[PDB]
Amino acid sequence: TSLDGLPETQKYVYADEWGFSRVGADFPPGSHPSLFSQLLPQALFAFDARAAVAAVAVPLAAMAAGYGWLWYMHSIAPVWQQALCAALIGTGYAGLFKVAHECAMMRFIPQMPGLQAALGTLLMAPALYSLPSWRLHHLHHLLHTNMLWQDVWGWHPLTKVELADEMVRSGGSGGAAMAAARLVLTTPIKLFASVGHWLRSWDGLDLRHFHPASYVEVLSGWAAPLAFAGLVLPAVVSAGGLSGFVSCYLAPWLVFHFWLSVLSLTAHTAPHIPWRAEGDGWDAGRAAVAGTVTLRLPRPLEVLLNNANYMLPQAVAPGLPMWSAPAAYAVLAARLGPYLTEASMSLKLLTNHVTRWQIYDEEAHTYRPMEEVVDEIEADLQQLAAAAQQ
Amino acid sequence: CLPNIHTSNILNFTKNYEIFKSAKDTSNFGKKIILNEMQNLT
Numbered sequence: 306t307s308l309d310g311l312p313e314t315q316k317y318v319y320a321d322e323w324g325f326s327r328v329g330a331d332f333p334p335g336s337h338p339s340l341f342s343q344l345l346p347q348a349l350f351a352f353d354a355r356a357a358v359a360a361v362a363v364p365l366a367a368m369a370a371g372y373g374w375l376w377y378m379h380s381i382a383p384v385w386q387q388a389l390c391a392a393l394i395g396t397g398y399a400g401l402f403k404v405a406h407e408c409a410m411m412r413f414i415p416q417m418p419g420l421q422a423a424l425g426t427l428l429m430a431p432a433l434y435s436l437p438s439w440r441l442h443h444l445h446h447l448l449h450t451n452m453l454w455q456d457v458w459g460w461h462p463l464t465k466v467e468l469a470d471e472m473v474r475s476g477g478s479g480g481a482a483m484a485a486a487r488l489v490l491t492t493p494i495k496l497f498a499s500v501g502h503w504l505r506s507w508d509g510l511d512l513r514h515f516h517p518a519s520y521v522e523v524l525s526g527w528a529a530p531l532a533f534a535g536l537v538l539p540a541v542v543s544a545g546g547l548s549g550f551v552s553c554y555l556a557p558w559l560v561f562h563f564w565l566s567v568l569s570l571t572a573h574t575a576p577h578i579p580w581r582a583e584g585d586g587w588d589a590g591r592a593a594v595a596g597t598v599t600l601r602l603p604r605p606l607e608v609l610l611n612n613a614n615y616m617l618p619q620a621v622a623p624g625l626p627m628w629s630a631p632a633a634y635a636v637l638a639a640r641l642g643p644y645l646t647e648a649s650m651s652l653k654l655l656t657n658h659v660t661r662w663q664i665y666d667e668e669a670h671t672y673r674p675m676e677e678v679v680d681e682i683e684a685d686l687q688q689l690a691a692a693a694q695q
Numbered sequence: 696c697l698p699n700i701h702t703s704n705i706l707n708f709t710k711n712y713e714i715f716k717s718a719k720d721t722s723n724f725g726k727k728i729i730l731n732e733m734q735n736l737t
């Protein structure tokens with residue numbers, strides 16, 4: 306809660322300035338994000354075979370159609386046809402990956418835990434992701450949602466005092482670190498920053514970060530990815546050459562990583578959402594429901610990605626199945642309507658994420674552009690130097 | 696000479712222990728992987 310209670314007219318003009326479909330109402334402290342799970346009917350937690358098999362076999366068919374189309378004209382295709390096939394395959398794999406992320410939290414087919422764990426491992430493998438490290442990081446996210454200095458497995462924002470500290474530690478903005486930060490948080494490569502998250506899994510490939518009674522499970526978790534990049538990745542190259550690798554593997558990879566990064570970045574970032582450190586005003590239900598955003602999709606994309614944008618219906622109910630995530634949302638707006646936040650697909654939203662909302666300041670408790678912030682903390686350096694000439 | 700071991704007590708336990716240990720190798724360091732499989736979400 307940052308731009309909390311004031312007339313709804315200015316929050317609506319803010320929502321139109323930012324492309325947001327709504328801005329939340331006031332939320333009082335002392336609540337549990339599991340509370341509002343008592344509202345949903347006792348049939349929203351139901352199990353059925355047809356919906357799940359559709360959710361797994363539809364993006365599969367998308368990917369298969371894209372591959373068949375490509376292998377039909379393997380490398381004689383032009384550039385934008387290649388881009389179309391890459392986007393289609395990456396979207397199908399994002400859907401399959403959401404099925405994976407479902408069976409990782411044990412809420413896909415609880416009837417067969419072994420079969421569902423094997424399915425999650427198999428479907429995470431082609432993206433080079435270990436199932437148990439993913440599960441640990443996602444629970445560690447849920448526990449610290451929107452907490453400062455604590456949720457590093459989400460989109461932890463870069464704050465002001467730390468950037469001034471690095472400014473002094475590098476001796477100006479001309480070092481490698483400052484230039485890297487600028488170039489990564491200013492250009493559309495930010496929309497692919499999830500790649501860096503993939504390099505923060507494999508926690509140094511170090512079992513000293515885990516609980517001993519889990520070692521044999523963590524290593525097997527690092528096995529299915531490695532084995533893949535040890536067996537299949539060669540074969541492809543062997544049978545396709547360098548170009549034949551940049552086509553059938555790397556581009557769908559960048560597509561899936563784009564989808565992942567933008568989903569998360571738009572789900573938990575907004576100027577009307579503050580990032581408090583706990584002790585200095587944090588709360589579970591507040592930073593859960595009030596500091597969140599839900600995005601809108603075309604129903605084709607929603608049946609492809611398998612409800613990949615409904616993150617709150619399963620943050621109030623961690624055991625809510627996947628084919629019921631829209632329906633549950635239907636109930637939630639009926640109850641917490643004024644406090645919800647919503648948004649849609651718009652290149653304007655992404656452009657504001659790229660150019661406007663770049664640095665988080667805790668004084669105004671909101672996001673600011675990076676060049677203005679950098680010139681102004683250079684001005685504060687001028688200030689402290691003026692206090693230092695004598 | 697001889698130390699008349701059967702009317703002793705430290706000689707009794709040390710003797711039986713050394714004989715038992717020398718009979719056969721009974722060390723098992725490879726049965727502790729069961730200790731690295733106690734938390735599995737499968």
Ligand SMILES: CC(C)CCC[C@@H](C)[C@H]1CC[C@H]2[C@@H]3CC=C4C[C@@H](OC(=O)CCC(=O)O)CC[C@]4(C)[C@H]3CC[C@]12C
Nearest residue numbers: 433503504505506507508509510511530531534535538
């Ligand atoms: C070459 C491609 C096509 C196949 C797949 C390769 C991956 C399995 C490799 C490539 C990059 C590797 C990572 C690059 C860097 C690191 C850090 C490195 O650990 C450290 O540096 C320790 C911490 C520190 O030094 O501060 C080893 C693990 C890890 C995550 C590596 C894990 C294995 C990764 C993901």
